[PDB]
Each structure stands twice: as C-alpha cells, then as structure tokens.
C-alpha cells in the first residue's frame, strides 16, 4: 500500500505535468492567436476611418445632389 501509493503517485505526478505542460502550449497558442487578431482589429479601425472619411465627403457633397 505504502510502496503502491508511491507507485500510484508516480503515474499521478507523471500525468500531472502532462496535464500542465499540456496547458502551456495552448497558453502560448492563444497568445500568438490573440496578437494576430490585433492587426486584424487594426485594419478595421484604420479601414473604418477611411471607411468613414472618404465616404464622409460624399455627405458634404449632398448639396450638389
């Protein structure tokens, strides 16, 4: 039982890091993926502006219409 507990603890502590080295690569995957969405979110902010300003002048030119 005592020796067995130690043995049990071996396959405990083996899968313990194998659960938590495993938590690390998903932790680093989100950080690559979240920062990659930042420049996805950057293009929309810049785009929305030009998405608004160039578009915006046309509203000023409505008096011609």
């Amino acid at each position: 039982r005592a020796d067995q507990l130690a043995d049990e603890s071996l396959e405990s502590t083996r899968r313990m890091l194998q659960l938590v080295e495993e938590s690390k690569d998903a932790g680093i995957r989100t950080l690559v993926m979240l920062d990659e969405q930042g420049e996805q979110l950057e293009r929309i902010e810049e785009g929305m502006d030009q998405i608004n300003k160039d578009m915006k002048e046309a509203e000023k030119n409505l008096t011609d219409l």
Partner: protein
C-alpha cells in the same frame, strides 16, 4: 530516485506555473485592449450605418 523525481517534477512543474501565470496574465490584458479597440470600431460602425441611411434617401429621391 522515487521521492527525488517527485521533487524533480514539482521543481519543473513550478518552473512552468511561474511562467504559465505570466503568459496567462498578458492574455488577460491583451483582450482588454482589444475590447476597447472593438469599442472604437463599434460605435463608429454604428455611426457609419446611420450616416449612409440618412444619405440613401438623399440618393433615392435624388
């Protein structure tokens, strides 16, 4: 060699969690910047719809 590797794993496990919190802490911050960053896009894409919707009838009746 048995209680050694229990330490030698929980030495290197605590060498992960001191990094694993670290990397999860920026993830708790990187989203917060983006939540503000979508929020600038949010009301502006709400305005840009409303401006054009004013301008559609100003190009429909025109």
């Amino acid at each position: 060699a048995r209680e050694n590797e229990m330490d030698e794993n929980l030495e290197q496990v605590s060498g992960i969690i001191g990094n694993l919190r670290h990397m999860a802490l920026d993830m708790g911050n990187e989203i917060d910047t983006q939540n503000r960053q979508i929020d600038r896009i949010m009301e502006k894409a709400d305005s840009n719809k409303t401006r054009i919707d004013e301008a559609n009838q100003r190009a429909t009746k025109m």
